[PDB]
Amino acid sequence: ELRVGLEESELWLRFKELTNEMIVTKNGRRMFPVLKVNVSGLDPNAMYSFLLDFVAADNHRWKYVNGEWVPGGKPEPQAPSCVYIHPDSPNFGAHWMKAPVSFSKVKLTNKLNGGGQIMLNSLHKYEPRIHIVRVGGPQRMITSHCFPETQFIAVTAYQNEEITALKIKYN
């Protein structure tokens, strides 16, 4: 059985208990914390690509009102985000299982942009998700995994200073 685990869940849970925020910019901003995944049970000799996307956790616009995040009352169906290909892709199962798979180079933006950067709906809440795609082989296969611990609201600047402080303390 293919096992997928979050590395540094301890730290993600500290962010999640405050409501996590990730900055989006026109040019794109890297994530802190970085999503790092522990993977076991791959065929060391099989070929895989690691994909990252962001699911809109709900259909609402969120606003920081008197020290607290609150959802709007006017939902709107959320279009799926684009997929980021881990730059080590494609690679042998052995490569992926030898150290945590680290999505350190994904950049989050608020503007339709050249290549790489993943565009998000601003002030929407997101749940990171990976797809492990077995490629090249006869039988194509996809395994998906969500990371609720890593949920965040996309922001153009931090709203909760407690988040600002944690981001600096642990970077």
Ligand X SMILES: COc1ccc(C)cc1NC(=O)CN
What are the backbone dihedrals phi and psi of residue 144, each rounded to the nearest 5 degrees, phi first?
Answer: -115, 150
Say whether residue 119 binds ligand X (CB under 6 A). yes
Binding piece for ligand X, criterion CB under 6 A, among 62-70, 72-80, 88-96, 128-136? 72-80
State which residue, 75 or 137, has the beta carbon closest to ligand X: 75
Single-letter amino acid code for the residue at 24: V
Run of H or E including 162: helix 161-170
Using CB under 6 A as the binding rule, the residues of this chain from 121 to 150 that contact ligand X are: 121
Tokens linked to 116: 């790489």
Residue 25 is classified by DSSP as B
Say whether residue 79 binds ligand X (CB under 6 A). yes
What gap in Å lies between CA 133 and CA 57, rounded to an integer?
Answer: 23
User: CB 145 → ligand X: shortest distance, Å?
Assistant: 19
Which of these, 48, 22, 44, lies nearest to 35 by C-alpha position? 22
Binding piece for ligand X, criterion CB under 6 A, among 21-29, 36-44, 77-85, 96-104? 77-85
Query: Is-contact 142 131, C-beta < 8 A?
Result: yes
Tokens linked to 168: 């600096």
Tokens linked to 124: 């929407």
Say whether residue 113 binds ligand X (CB under 6 A). no
Interface residue with ligand X, options 20, 81, 117, 150 (CB under 6 A): 81
Say whether residue 117 binds ligand X (CB under 6 A). no
What gap in Å lies between CA 21 and CA 156, rounded to an integer?
Answer: 10
State which residue, 30 or 111, has the beta carbon closest to ligand X: 111
User: CB 32 → ligand X: shortest distance, Å?
Assistant: 21
User: CB 55 → ligand X: shortest distance, Å?
Assistant: 10
Interface residue with ligand X, options 20, 78, 159, 160 (CB under 6 A): 78
Binding site for ligand X (CB under 6 A): 76-79, 81, 119-121
